[PDB]
């Protein structure tokens with residue numbers, strides 16, 4: 001009937017949002033089949049009620065009480081049919097699995113809860129308690145102005161406690177991870193490796209049945225094929241088009257091309273705990289060495305902007321008075337000389353193996369940086385690994401310097417600065433291994449304030465500090481594209497980059 005064909009560039013790492021932390025996986029699971037307690041309005045960073053119908057917050061900002069929606073049905077599959085509606089047990093399960101190392105599901109699928117860790121929920125959460133069947137009370141150890149928006153994030157999707165109970169009893173608990181059951185607008189209808197995953201409209205969805213009956217995420221790895229299929233009408237949406245095809249699609253009558261400035265940053269991270277990158281003068285030098293304009297031209301082809309802060313220009317708290325390091329090989333050489341490296345040195349540049357939102361060609365970007373560094377005496381080899389291995393090694397601190405990128409997930413500047421630069425996230429999401437007590441104090445103070453204007457002043461100061469300490473080269477903020485077929489109606493890009501299809505329709 002009404003089948004939306006979404007052509008995606010890679011197979012998902014997994015279908016359990018608590019266990020992963022990448023957009024392909026989220027798009028193929030939590031964005032379609034799960035709900036959160038609160039969710040973002042489409043195309044917006046504003047939050048609204050979802051599985052929590054309403055809530056209250058205590059005056060001290062430490063106690064959040066959630067009144068849960070009644071009448072909410074979970075999906076079924078061949079292995080499980082729910083015998084009760086969504087309730088507090090499902091919320092408690094979803095938190096406690098991650099929070100409690102001795103929860104029965106903590107080690108199922110060898111789970112590691114990467115985003116739960118980067119968000120520091122283990123130290124944030126004092127308790128998550130069932131008050132009654134339709135009421136959950138969460139107590140915090142400290143104030144967090146971003147907590148409600150954070151509860152809209154995919155990693156804290158609400159799973160089925162009944163499903164978990166049944167699958168554990170049957171001796172196959174991993175089933176809840178590979179074979180998702182949620183309350184969300186679409187339900188999981190199977191995955192064929194390196195071919196496609198399928199979804200169906202959840203007819204009993206609590207907010208009303210979706211206008212699209214069937215969804216297919218067809219895995220079409222070749223960008224050239226994705227474009228050809230879109231033109232033939234075999235795709236209704238594609239990701240990451242090739243540059244030359246993108247140029248054509250801007251004025252292609254068969255394409256409705258959506259675009260928006262990305263809430264993201266592509267960067268070179270320096271391992272600030274590893275000589276010679278532990279010398280701030282070296283990190284500043286390698287900034288001066290790089291011609292970002294040349295990267296915008298060659299890599300982004302103009303679809304992006306040279307970055308001056310790790311925050312994107314379109315988020316609040318962005319510091320407009322900050323300038324990037326100017327392109328000056330002369331200044332780079334002088335600093336390298338002062339650092340004791342007039343004769344330069346040898347190093348590696350780590351190259352990200354897959355394309356993500358913020359950078360359409362990590363390898364070409366690395367080649368350009370490599371060339372720039374060569375001009376100031378810094379010679380390098382490019383080093384890469386398969387995606388999972390690349391990130392694991394990076395987190396362990398094996399990198400020297402490397403290409404990475406980040407898209408924000410809750411609309412708040414804290415969700416850039418804390419995951420990326422907070423000392424507590426070294427080994428998690430802070431690849432530069434940056435530990436700066438002055439920054440930590442700024443971020444800790446800001447996150448708890450209710451006065452947004454004051455939060456903004458603090459983040460602005462934080463950006464001054466980050467420029468001076470140069471844990472990174474801020475490279476670019478990209479443009480997000482969503483090329484669609486002409487029959488797609490009412491589609492909206494997510495501010496965070498996700499493909500969210502509830503509320504989209506298909507014309508005749």
Ligand SMILES: N[C@@H](CCC(=O)N[C@@H](CSSC[C@H](NC(=O)CC[C@H](N)C(=O)O)C(=O)NCC(=O)O)C(=O)NCC(=O)O)C(=O)O
Nearest residue numbers: 022023024264356357358405406407480481482496497498
């Ligand atoms: N905050 C974490 C987890 C969230 C995350 O993975 N976000 C996605 C964007 S939403 S997931 C969608 C994204 N696709 C896009 O970026 C294409 C444009 C899109 N169609 C739109 O209209 O905005 C994608 O496929 N990405 C593949 C991947 O995440 O591995 C991402 O690409 N972040 C990394 C970055 O910005 O460099 C992170 O950034 O790594």
